[PDB]
């Protein structure tokens, strides 16, 4: 039988074009009275999964 996709890692990573992985930033769910304004513009963007952890979970979501 053919492979699954590791579902929780599919609802959180839009696979970009040209072979990279997009993610969102953390620390952004609920608690906001103690992080200043400057972090908040830094953490509503997206980012890329780094070269270290990409080696680990590239198998989980190689089915787009």
């Amino acid at each position: 039988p053919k492979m699954k996709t590791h579902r929780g890692s599919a609802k959180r990573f839009k696979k970009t074009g040209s072979g990279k992985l997009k993610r969102s930033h953390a620390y952004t769910s609920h608690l906001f009275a103690n992080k200043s304004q400057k972090q908040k513009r830094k953490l509503r963007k997206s980012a890329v999964v780094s070269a270290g952890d990409f080696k680990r979970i590239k198998q989980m979501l190689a089915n787009i």
Partner: protein, 97 residues
């Protein structure tokens, strides 16, 4: 898996939402029409069997990268704005199905 440390697929939030009603438009780079001659018929039934589009996924949109030189009877579902003028730049008609 990370031995007990919180694995990377959880400490990141969920920013996913998928609608039923999405439309994969067929993607034509407007330059495969240069394989044809000018004055020919451009229908989505013709773009399938000529090998231009391998799969009509309910909608044929024509993009605008590149250029044409051929007056064509172009009818299709949707059009990008530069593609509507590029067909007229070759003098071709720009019917919208």
């Amino acid at each position: 898996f990370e031995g007990g440390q919180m694995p990377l697929f959880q400490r990141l939030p969920k920013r996913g939402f998928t609608n039923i009603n999405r439309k994969e438009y067929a993607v034509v780079n407007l330059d495969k029409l240069n394989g044809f001659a000018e004055g020919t018929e451009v229908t989505p039934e013709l773009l399938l069997e000529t090998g231009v589009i391998s799969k009509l996924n309910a909608g044929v949109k024509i993009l605008g990268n590149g250029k044409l030189e051929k007056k064509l009877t172009v009818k299709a579902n949707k059009f990008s704005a530069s593609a509507k003028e590029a067909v007229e730049a070759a003098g071709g008609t720009a019917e919208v199905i």
